[PDB]
Amino acid sequence: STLSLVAKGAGVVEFLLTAYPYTGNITFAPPWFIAENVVKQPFMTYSDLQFAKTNPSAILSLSTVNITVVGLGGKASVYYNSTSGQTVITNIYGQTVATLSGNVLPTLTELAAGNGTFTGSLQFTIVPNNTVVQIPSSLTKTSFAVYTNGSLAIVLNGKAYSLGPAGLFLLPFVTYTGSAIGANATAIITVSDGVGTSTTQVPI
């Protein structure tokens, strides 16, 4: 029978993209932040439930079955699932995108006897995916055709995995007429003049 469980906080989310930026010059990085609609608690479904269901809490261990990383839209997660025995990494598309053998993320565990608190520390780059957004010729008269802001991309051991659009996460971004605009995009600016129409392009 299910009995007494002490559970309080849990992991800690990082809000900078660390240990490999994807900046055009690698030396330089701007102040990335993953968007902070993080509803909070890296979800702490105990490995040692049966222990939970008997004894109140001691040093308690976890399937690190999630780490919440909510943003503007969807969520992503990097979660050491101690019932596969490997690092399951998911993304905002929905899917397991990598699955990395054995222990190559450390185990979340309780820091004390009587507690409900766990750790968190994450390291990212950006690998982009892109998707055109059209902007009128009724403003500047230069029709902008704008690729989606970058795409978050976790790193473990120097190996990169898409976590999906960084215009549903990485802040600050900006919008001009609801067009996601920020690092590692391009706008094809279709410059319509009394000469006709040229088409230049500007990389972001």
Binding site: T142, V191, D193, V195, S198, T200
Partner: protein, 152 residues
């Protein structure tokens, strides 16, 4: 005096204001080459140089004009009511001596025309004090690009 004083000049990005070519009169200067723009919007990419600490800021005046409306016998466009604009040039607002910016890359802005034509263009520019400011120039301030093309 020469603690602040500051000559200031305009020249292309094709040839720097770091040092401008001897095809410049003091009383005129039609550049015999071209602005080569980026065509995102027509943007007079140039240099400007301010030497000494400049305590106020100033202007890079600018006006888009048809080349069908040009007088090439005195370097003065003859018509075209289209669009005009100008740039702020900040160095710093220095409180005397010790704050200067030697090279200032100024990409002159004109934008907000979008209901009036475009064609083959000529554009006059000028290193312009703020409204009868401090004493600029060992020249040229005055920059008339004979070759421009407008994009709206």
């Amino acid at each position: 005096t020469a603690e602040n004083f500051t000559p200031i000049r305009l020249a292309p990005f094709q040839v720097p204001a770091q040092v401008p070519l001897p095809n410049a009169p003091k009383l005129k200067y039609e550049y015999n080459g071209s602005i080569v723009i980026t065509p995102q919007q027509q943007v007079l990419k140039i240099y400007v140089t301010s030497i000494l600490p400049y305590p106020q800021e100033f202007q890079i005046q600018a006006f888009v004009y048809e080349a069908s409306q040009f007088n090439v016998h005195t370097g003065s466009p003859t018509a075209a009511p289209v669009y005009f604009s100008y740039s702020a040039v900040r160095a710093y607002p220095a409180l005397g001596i010790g704050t200067s910016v030697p090279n200032l890359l100024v990409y002159v802005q004109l934008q907000g025309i979008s209901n009036l034509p475009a064609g083959k263009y000529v554009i006059v520019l000028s290193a312009v004090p703020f409204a009868g400011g401090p004493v600029l120039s060992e020249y040229p301030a005055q920059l008339i690009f004979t070759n421009v093309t407008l994009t709206q």
